[PDB]
Amino acid sequence: RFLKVKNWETDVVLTDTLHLKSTLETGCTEHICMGSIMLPTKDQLFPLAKEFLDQYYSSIKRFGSKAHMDRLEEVNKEIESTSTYQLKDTELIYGAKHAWRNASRCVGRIQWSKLQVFDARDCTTAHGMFNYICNHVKYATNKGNLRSAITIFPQRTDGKHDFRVWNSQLIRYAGYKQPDGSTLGDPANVQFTEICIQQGWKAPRGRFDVLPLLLQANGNDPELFQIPPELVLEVPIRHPKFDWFKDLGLKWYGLPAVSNMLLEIGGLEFSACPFSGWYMGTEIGVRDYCDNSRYNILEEVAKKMDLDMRKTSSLWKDQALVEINIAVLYSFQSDKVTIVDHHSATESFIKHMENEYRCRGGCPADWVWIVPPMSGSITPVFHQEMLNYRLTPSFEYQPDPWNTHVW
Amino acid sequence: RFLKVKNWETDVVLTDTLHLKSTLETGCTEHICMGSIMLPVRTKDQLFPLAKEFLDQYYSSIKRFGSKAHMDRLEEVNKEIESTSTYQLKDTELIYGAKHAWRNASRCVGRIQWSKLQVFDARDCTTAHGMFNYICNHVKYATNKGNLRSAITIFPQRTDGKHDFRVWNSQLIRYAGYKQPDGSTLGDPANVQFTEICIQQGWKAPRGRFDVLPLLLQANGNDPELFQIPPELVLEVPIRHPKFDWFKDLGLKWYGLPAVSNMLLEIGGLEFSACPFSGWYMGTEIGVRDYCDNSRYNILEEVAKKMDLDMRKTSSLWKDQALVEINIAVLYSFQSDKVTIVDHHSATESFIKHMENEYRCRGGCPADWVWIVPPMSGSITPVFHQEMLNYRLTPSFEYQPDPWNTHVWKG
Ligand code: HEM
Ligand code: HEM
Ligand SMILES: Cc1cc(N)nc(CCc2cccc(CCc3cc(C)nc(N)c3)n2)c1
Ligand SMILES: Cc1cc(N)nc(CCc2cccc(CCc3cc(C)nc(N)c3)n2)c1
Ligand SMILES: C[C@H](O)[C@H](O)[C@H]1CNc2nc(N)[nH]c(=O)c2N1
Ligand SMILES: C[C@H](O)[C@H](O)[C@H]1CNc2nc(N)[nH]c(=O)c2N1
Ligand SMILES: [Zn+2]
Numbered sequence: 001r002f003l004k005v006k007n008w009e010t011d012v013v014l015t016d017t018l019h020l021k022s023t024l025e026t027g028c029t030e031h032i033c034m035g036s037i038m039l040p041t042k043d044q045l046f047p048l049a050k051e052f053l054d055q056y057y058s059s060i061k062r063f064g065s066k067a068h069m070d071r072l073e074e075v076n077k078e079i080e081s082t083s084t085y086q087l088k089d090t091e092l093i094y095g096a097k098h099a100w101r102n103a104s105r106c107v108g109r110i111q112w113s114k115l116q117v118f119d120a121r122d123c124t125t126a127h128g129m130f131n132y133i134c135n136h137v138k139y140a141t142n143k144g145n146l147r148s149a150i151t152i153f154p155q156r157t158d159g160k161h162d163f164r165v166w167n168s169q170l171i172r173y174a175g176y177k178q179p180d181g182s183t184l185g186d187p188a189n190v191q192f193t194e195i196c197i198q199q200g201w202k203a204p205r206g207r208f209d210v211l212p213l214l215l216q217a218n219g220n221d222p223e224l225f226q227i228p229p230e231l232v233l234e235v236p237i238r239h240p241k242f243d244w245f246k247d248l249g250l251k252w253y254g255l256p257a258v259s260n261m262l263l264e265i266g267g268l269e270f271s272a273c274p275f276s277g278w279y280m281g282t283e284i285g286v287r288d289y290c291d292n293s294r295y296n297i298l299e300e301v302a303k304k305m306d307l308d309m310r311k312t313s314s315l316w317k318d319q320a321l322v323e324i325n326i327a328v329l330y331s332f333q334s335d336k337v338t339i340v341d342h343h344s345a346t347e348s349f350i351k352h353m354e355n356e357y358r359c360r361g362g363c364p365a366d367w368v369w370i371v372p373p374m375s376g377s378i379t380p381v382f383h384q385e386m387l388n389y390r391l392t393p394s395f396e397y398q399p400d401p402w403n404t405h406v407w
Numbered sequence: 408r409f410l411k412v413k414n415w416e417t418d419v420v421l422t423d424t425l426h427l428k429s430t431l432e433t434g435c436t437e438h439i440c441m442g443s444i445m446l447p448v449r450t451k452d453q454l455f456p457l458a459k460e461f462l463d464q465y466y467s468s469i470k471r472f473g474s475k476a477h478m479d480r481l482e483e484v485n486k487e488i489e490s491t492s493t494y495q496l497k498d499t500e501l502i503y504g505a506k507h508a509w510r511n512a513s514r515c516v517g518r519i520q521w522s523k524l525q526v527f528d529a530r531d532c533t534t535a536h537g538m539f540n541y542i543c544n545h546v547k548y549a550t551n552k553g554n555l556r557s558a559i560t561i562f563p564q565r566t567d568g569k570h571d572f573r574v575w576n577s578q579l580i581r582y583a584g585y586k587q588p589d590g591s592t593l594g595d596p597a598n599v600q601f602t603e604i605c606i607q608q609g610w611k612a613p614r615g616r617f618d619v620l621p622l623l624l625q626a627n628g629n630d631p632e633l634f635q636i637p638p639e640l641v642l643e644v645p646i647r648h649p650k651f652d653w654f655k656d657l658g659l660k661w662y663g664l665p666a667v668s669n670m671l672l673e674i675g676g677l678e679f680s681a682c683p684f685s686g687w688y689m690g691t692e693i694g695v696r697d698y699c700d701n702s703r704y705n706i707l708e709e710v711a712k713k714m715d716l717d718m719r720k721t722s723s724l725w726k727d728q729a730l731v732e733i734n735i736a737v738l739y740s741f742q743s744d745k746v747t748i749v750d751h752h753s754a755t756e757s758f759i760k761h762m763e764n765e766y767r768c769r770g771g772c773p774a775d776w777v778w779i780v781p782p783m784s785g786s787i788t789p790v791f792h793q794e795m796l797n798y799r800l801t802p803s804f805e806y807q808p809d810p811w812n813t814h815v816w817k818g
Pocket of ligand 3: 108256257258275276277278279280283397
């Protein structure tokens with residue numbers, strides 16, 4: 001019932017009580033741990049509503065008050081009458097902020113409470129969606145001084161009228177499968193890019209083509225929009241010592257903005273809720289650049305450093321990896337685009353865990369995702385036991401829309 | 408019930424049926440995953456099912472399930488349990504059991520080698536001098552002048568829990584740590600406690616940075632006894648770097664032979680509380696963890712100083728740079744001295760092949776991602792992108808409490 005987590009570097013022991021509130025399931029059993037798997041009615045709705053409003057009214061220290069009881073009856077009467085309900089602005093902001101607070105895979109949560117929430121529940125068309133998104137992009141980018149934000153389109157109704165952003169990120173690069181046999185640009189986005197072309201996009205067929213938005217409103221067929229180029233801040237990648245690095249033609253965008261997830265607050269489902277923060281360096285340098293199935297540039301870089309690639313044991317991949325990552329961080333810092341390195345981000349998360357344990361009785365965390373994909377054991381999160389459990393409000397995956405949507 | 412695991416780099420999808428033969432629990436529930444928790448006297452009643460289950464596995468593997476030899480062995484074990492309250496394994500059952508414990512070790516990336524294991528049966532051992540001799544022979548055979556060979560030595564099983572055989576050392580070869588009055592540590596901070604015990608038991612500590620610890624050996628539940636491994640048997644590698652000539656002047660070396668001596672081997676319900684085993688190192692065990700943990704030799708600062716990295720801002724990745732050069736040095740040193748070692752690229756690639764073969768032939772390969780992914784350069788190794796399923800098969804290696812916490816001192 002009370003659970004302990006030890007840090008094996010500092011011997012610090014923390015007691016988790018928060019997990020008893022856990023309200024969704026993990027995919028694990030006593031017979032099998034699924035910790036490393038990527039993806040494991042009016043009656044239903046009121047408990048969910050109650051559960052959330054109880055926590056909300058607890059947070060403003062008004063639990064069991066008149067205002068609390070009144071709201072609970074209001075929502076009860078709204079559900080029984082309308083089969084759903086609407087969140088007050090204060091509730092909405094709280095729910096979004098907590099969805100991030102509870103994201104067990106997010107290392108950047110020390111920032112959870114500084115989230116700008118843009119209420120787009122009045123949106124009705126894809127064109128409106130595009131306006132709301134451009135404003136989000138520009139507000140968050142902030143000339144390089146990045147600011148966390150989320151924009152929240154209308155909640156699901158009968159699920160025949162969903163709002164969806166088809167892009168997986170607001171800003172991503174196209175991928176085209178070539179007669180050659182290889183892949184030009186980002187191999188992660190072939191299927192979506194093809195979908196764009198099929199809906200009508202004029203693809204330029206470059207390596208770093210910013211994808212168009214594909215926006216679905218009120219269950220309708222989605223439409224294409226190009227984000228004003230002047231709103232998409234990009235960074236050319238150079239190395240502080242290797243002059244030749246720039247000759248790779250590498251760039252990345254400043255704004256990371258996940259657009260394909262579902263926000264669940266008090267039982268209500270917000271299927272279009274793009275949110276953005278700022279990058280940890282390894283996300284681009286290790287994953288985007290080096291993943292065999294991504295831009296996969298290790299071989300090229302190594303050659304330019306003139307390393308012995310005859311034998312795995314010269315650690316040439318590791319040598320090139322560090323340099324690629326040094327360059328990402330240098331390039332962003334020099335251009336004054338907010339970025340954080342894995343040492344600093346994981347140290348911050350450790351301070352955040354301790355705060356959550358002391359002020360909330362715990363912090364759900366998924367070690368598999370929290371430990372950076374390079375230099376794991378020299379960051380403090382490596383040695384930190386973590387308990388992973390599912391709290392609501394939350395962000396959830398949802399099927400890619402082209403699998404669901406009927407045209 | 409079938410379970411799928413996907414590789415996100417290759418899209419290879421595998422199907423596990425083997426998790427169905429799982430007995431022991433995980434620590435996880437439907438409501439909480441404990442997959443990153445480090446550490447998540449049997450009756451007759453409990454013993455016979457465990458025996459039967461083991462002997463069923465064994466007779467299947469030799470293609471003799473349900474033979475007369477199979478039924479007779481069951482009945483013979485049956486009686487031995489009913490009459491003596493325990494039982495003895497045949498040599499072949501022990502070999503098989505020790506190999507399977509390794510095969511089943513979900514946190515071990517080196518399992519492609521599981522069927523090549525030299526088993527030394529030390530169940531006739533009765534004294535701590537006896538154990539010492541057994542362990543010297545294991546050390547010599549395993550070392551093999553640098554061409555390392557996997558081996559395990561198996562001392563008599565637990566009886567009433569009052570007569571346990573234990574090796575108090577966590578590894579057969581490890582360096583002393585000495586906490587100084589000024590609060591700093593000389594040698595390996597990981598071994599301070601055990602070092603103190605050794606000194607308390609009467610070891611004369613040389614007090615250097617790399618002193619091989621004496622063996623501390625308990626036989627038959629008796630108080631343990633100190634023995635120095637003959638230095639001629641302790642293969643060491645001095646650490647130097649291929650391009651950086653100042654690296655040797657750091658004064659570093661390490662031992663060639665990784666040999667865990669504090670785990671418990673469980674076979675068919677029987678508990679073997681002293682069962683030291685050894686293989687060979689993956690380079691990152693020394694260069695990432697032994698040298699670079701803040702709680703260990705903690706050499707990252709000194710190395711980066713000497714490389715003249717920019718150390719004012721963590722964002723130079725000075726730590727990451729030093730870490731790679733240290734690990735380059737470790738592998739270069741071992742290879743140059745012809746001591747067996749494997750890098751983390753080669754080991755993880757080998758593990759992925761092992762894992763697919765295991766799915767094809769055994770219907771599964773239980774695997775702990777937290778432990779299998781190397782502690783540097785995780786995502787440019789093929790395990791990072793491999794979904795794994797973690798579950799517990801017997802035979803197995805388990806932890807046990809350190810014996811200085813449980814031992815009843817005789818005097
Ligand atoms: C502000 C700085 C932020 C940093 C440094 C950061 C960092 C990260 C990183 C490194 C990951 C793992 C990424 C991967 O390997 O794909 C991640 C995942 C995640 N982040 Fe954060 N993030 C930030 C902002 C935000 C915000 C504003 C939100 C939501 C409002 C958010 C929600 C999430 C969620 C739900 C995941 C896991 C998603 C999944 O399971 O696929 N992050 N974050
Ligand atoms: C042949 C060369 C071997 C290699 C390269 C290898 C590699 C490794 C590594 C890197 C670890 C994780 C160690 C740590 O991070 O502390 C490990 C764990 C483990 N190894 Fe292997 N190993 C080898 C041989 C063996 C042998 C011979 C056995 C026993 C017969 C064995 C049984 C285990 C077990 C039970 C664990 C997990 C221990 C735990 O749960 O803490 N290994 N191995
Ligand atoms: C806000 C934010 C801040 C930050 N620094 N980085 C990101 C991008 C990393 C990220 C954050 C949250 C969710 C996802 C999607 C991960 C994913 C999902 C699926 C379905 N398949 C994958 N292979 C990967 N990616 C977003
Ligand atoms: C045969 C073998 C081959 C190889 N390449 N490496 C080793 C040494 C690594 C190892 C293998 C098995 C068990 C342990 C003990 C790990 C441990 C456990 C706890 C509870 N705390 C720790 N700090 C460390 N370490 C052994
Ligand atoms: C807290 C965490 O589970 C712990 O530090 C583990 C993580 N993964 C590991 N992996 C290996 N191979 N060895 C270890 O000691 C650890 N330590
Ligand atoms: C199989 C494994 O679960 C998968 O590779 C995960 C591992 N850890 C990760 N960690 C982060 N931060 N992001 C990822 O996409 C992944 N992929
Ligand atoms: Zn689990």
